[PDB]
């Protein structure tokens, strides 16, 4: 029964501060360091610093240096990281990491590898304001097709926060499904794509609609995603 | 610092098989190496420390080896559950404890090319400012392609977006999808749009296109 | 019981490479850090680099990066700092020390220094000195004293009796005489009671040309 | 890059005194701060650790404090052993030492004690007479030597060297030495060593007749 218990999830506009939390319990955590990890979305992990839970010492790394603020509540086993004037690149899961043995590390001491940590707080930097998707039809056509298969999707444009949960004909719709992940483009504003593969022969018949629900602005999107319709036809 | 480079970036690897990870160093780290296991959405679980030993609770097929500058990670039986991304973490020098990049072990399969698909921009969104025209790669093998965006003969530079789905759990594939994101009269300007695909699964890059009309 | 020794003093030509030791006792050398800090005369102490002897780790500063190598022979226990391509600015007092670890407060200090060793950037040659006696011409004190004349290069240690006799000692700075060769005095006050009844002798050692002379005072 | 500011650059106090150095750094170094005595002609001692880990055997006089880029070492009440330079240390961004703070002390006027020695029957055989005149325990460091050579000044032939102030009493000495040939020091009999100070009356002369 050793685990650290980490605080929620964060949004925080530019220029603003977060103070995520770390919980221990199954040992003694004075006898302990205390780490700081993170990881941007699709990067490798960063080590920030630590804290010597037992005397309050500290040590951080020189990217951070100036904004990075690492505390200790011996009352409460708690250890806190505080990250000042956040900028769009400061979007990462902090994870609190309690490395295998006890005390400092030095010559003849290398103890920093840690087996010790905590699920993971993401922390998104974002001037943007909750706004519900705007749905568009990825429509099917001969252009679509191969081998009697067609494609078919939902453009799911310029929502936030995250996430929106995506179905298809109201859950009755789930194989040859692809949603793919989401997004962040220069607006700040998250975008996605949901595409189906179905018969290419029954597109005249079937009835294909994404549903798109987005809890944060309470916004449900029902799009119909009809085959490819032509405002004229022509010759030479 | 110590930049902890990770090759290959990712590992085709099928079951049952040895998987050889490798971990270098730009200067001497001794035996001062650890392994991570990280699956998506999950904290990394310390597998191997000093280079070789294993940490308590890890089960034996997972081993580990080297000193200085070049490391390797071992799973002689490679099961269900060790598909993941490892990583390769120093702890001979500090500030700053550093990490590598990373390599994930994929299941591997037949070299299955992509089928390859170009979305024009809904009259929806059309009628609104901004204009999106996506590509669609889907059930392709391996996961490395390159998609390039051409309008009237001319090159795409950062004007789009792109994202990859996680290896399909029954036949294994990738899928991916790029969007070209423009606005009227930027998409009002220009005739043909098209996306050209670069992919080992076939002969010569696949090119998919529309005229605006 | 815990000990820094270091190395003599060293006369090197411009140009060429010193290396200078380090031997720790009374402690494991692979359990703390040993710095390089160095310091020409009235001048700030400036730190040059640090060595983990453990794993042999190296952190210098950038200006004496490349010029500067530490290095550690852990078996001996001691550790070395070599500097190439010297120059006259390079003259200064070479110092190493330890960076031990703090129980009760989780943290590293720089807490014991080596005596120090001097590296002379000179072509001139080594000339040991001449010892002569100061003594009165034929008061309740008296002062006695020795001539440390025409040596070069610096330094020379005085001590009296032995070092039995050090309360009322003024060992001097040298000068510089036109020959390019130091002259320094070293005295001593006792009581004119005594002068008969006790034997004064300064013990001069000038180590760069091998130099110990033990001259008696009358 | 990091910098630092060591204020002042020397000062002077009297026994009893409050000495105060402070230390300013160009970003936080977390209270990797420490604080090192260095006497003269003796190596770098350290005296704190980390903002204020008094070391031990060090007396209770001497105390740091401070946090972020500002901190202050104290001594209460200076003694004659604390005559030295100081120097604050930043250990978080690689290390950096202080320009350092020479601390001298203010004393009561103390005049010297006088002596004469004449050249060594081993020096002359090798031709060269050196005279020393020494000036023993004063205060202020300022002090006249006039070498008289059958009462006549010399000039260009002199040398002299001052120690550094004392650990016990926190006076000067000085040690003048006049330099001639066998020759010329056979040429003459009263050879003098006239010292003027602020502590003295009257100046002082010592003297000997050669034989």
């Known amino acids: 029964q050793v685990h650290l218990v980490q605080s929620g999830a964060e949004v925080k506009k530019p220029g603003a501060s977060v103070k995520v939390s770390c919980k221990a319990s199954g040992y003694t955590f004075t006898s302990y360091t205390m780490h700081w990890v993170r990881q941007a979305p699709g990067q490798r992990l960063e080590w920030m610093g630590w804290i010597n839970a037992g005397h309050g010492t500290t040590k951080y790394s020189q990217k951070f240096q100036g904004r990075v603020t690492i505390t200790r509540d011996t009352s409460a086993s708690t250890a806190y990281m505080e990250l000042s004037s956040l900028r769009s690149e400061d979007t990462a899961v902090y994870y609190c990491?309690?490395?295998?043995?006890?005390?400092?590390?030095?010559?003849?001491?290398?103890?920093?590898?840690?087996?010790?940590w905590g699920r993971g707080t993401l922390v998104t930097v974002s001037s943007a304001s909750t706004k519900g998707p705007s749905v568009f039809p990825l429509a099917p056509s001969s252009k679509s097709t191969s081998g009697g298969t067609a494609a078919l999707g939902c453009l799911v444009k310029d929502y936030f926060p995250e996430p929106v949960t995506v179905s298809w004909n109201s859950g009755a719709l789930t194989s040859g499904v692809h949603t793919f992940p989401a997004v962040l483009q220069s607006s700040g504003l998250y975008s996605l794509s949901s595409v189906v593969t179905v018969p290419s022969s029954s597109l005249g018949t079937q009835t294909y609609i994404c549903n798109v629900n987005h809890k944060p602005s309470n916004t449900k999107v029902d799009k119909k995603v009809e085959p490819k319709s032509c405002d004229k036809t022509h010759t030479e | 610092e110590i930049v902890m480079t990770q090759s290959p970036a990712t590992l085709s690897v099928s079951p049952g098989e040895r998987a050889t990870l490798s971990c270098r160093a730009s200067?001497?780290?001794?035996?001062?190496l650890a392994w991570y296991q990280q699956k998506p959405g999950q904290a990394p679980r310390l597998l191997i420390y000093?280079?070789?030993t294993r940490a308590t609770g890890i089960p034996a097929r997972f081993s580990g080896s080297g000193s200085g500058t070049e490391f390797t990670l071992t799973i002689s039986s490679l099961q269900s559950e060790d598909f993941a991304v490892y990583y390769c973490?120093?702890?001979?020098?500090?500030?700053?404890?550093?990490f590598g990049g990373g390599t994930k072990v994929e299941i591997k399969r037949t070299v299955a090319a992509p089928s390859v698909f170009i979305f024009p921009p809904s009259d929806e969104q059309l009628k609104s400012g901004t204009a999106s025209v996506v590509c669609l790669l889907n059930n392709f093998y391996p996961r490395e392609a390159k998609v390039q965006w051409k309008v009237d003969n001319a090159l795409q530079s950062g004007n789009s977006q792109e994202s990859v789905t996680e290896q399909d759990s029954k036949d294994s594939t990738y899928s991916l999808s790029s969007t070209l994101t423009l606005s009227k009269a930027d998409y009002e300007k220009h005739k043909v749009y098209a996306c050209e695909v670069t992919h080992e699964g076939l002969s010569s890059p696949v090119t998919k296109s529309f005229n605006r009309g | 019981?815990?000990?820094?020794?270091?190395?003599?003093?060293?006369?090197?030509?411009?140009?060429?490479?010193?290396?200078?030791?380090?031997?720790?006792?009374?402690?494991?050398?692979?359990?703390?850090?040993?710095?390089?800090?160095?310091?020409?005369?009235?001048?700030?102490?400036?730190?040059?680099?640090?060595?983990?002897?453990?794993?042999?780790?190296?952190?210098?500063?950038?200006?004496?990066?490349?010029?500067?190598?530490?290095?550690?022979?852990?078996?001996?226990?001691?550790?070395?700092?070599?500097?190439?391509?010297?120059?006259?600015?390079?003259?200064?007092?070479?110092?190493?020390?330890?960076?031990?670890?703090?129980?009760?407060?989780?943290?590293?200090?720089?807490?014991?220094?080596?005596?120090?060793?001097?590296?002379?950037?000179?072509?001139?040659?080594?000339?040991?000195?001449?010892?002569?006696?100061?003594?009165?011409?034929?008061?309740?004190?008296?002062?006695?004293?020795?001539?440390?004349?025409?040596?070069?290069?610096?330094?020379?240690?005085?001590?009296?009796?032995?070092?039995?006799?050090?309360?009322?000692?003024?060992?001097?700075?040298?000068?510089?005489?036109?020959?390019?060769?130091?002259?320094?005095?070293?005295?001593?006050?006792?009581?004119?009671?005594?002068?008969?009844?006790?034997?004064?002798?300064?013990?001069?050692?000038?180590?760069?040309?091998?130099?110990?002379?033990?001259?008696?005072?009358? | 890059?990091?910098?630092?500011?060591?204020?002042?650059?020397?000062?002077?106090?009297?026994?009893?005194?409050?000495?105060?150095?402070?230390?300013?750094?160009?970003?936080?170094?977390?209270?990797?701060?420490?604080?090192?005595?260095?006497?003269?002609?003796?190596?770098?001692?350290?005296?704190?650790?980390?903002?204020?880990?008094?070391?031990?055997?060090?007396?209770?006089?001497?105390?740091?404090?401070?946090?972020?880029?500002?901190?202050?070492?104290?001594?209460?009440?200076?003694?004659?052993?604390?005559?030295?330079?100081?120097?604050?240390?930043?250990?978080?961004?690689?290390?950096?030492?202080?320009?350092?703070?020479?601390?001298?002390?203010?004393?009561?006027?103390?005049?010297?004690?006088?002596?004469?020695?004449?050249?060594?029957?081993?020096?002359?055989?090798?031709?060269?007479?050196?005279?020393?005149?020494?000036?023993?325990?004063?205060?202020?460091?300022?002090?006249?030597?006039?070498?008289?050579?059958?009462?006549?000044?010399?000039?260009?032939?002199?040398?002299?060297?001052?120690?550094?102030?004392?650990?016990?009493?926190?006076?000067?000495?000085?040690?003048?030495?006049?330099?001639?040939?066998?020759?010329?020091?056979?040429?003459?009999?009263?050879?003098?060593?006239?010292?003027?100070?602020?502590?003295?009356?009257?100046?002082?002369?010592?003297?000997?007749?050669?034989?």
């Open positions: 200067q001497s780290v001794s035996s001062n």
């Open positions: 973490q120093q702890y001979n020098n500090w500030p700053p404890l550093t």
């Open positions: 000093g280079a070789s």
């Open positions: 990491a309690r490395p295998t043995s006890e005390g400092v590390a030095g010559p003849s001491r290398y103890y920093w590898y840690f087996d010790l």
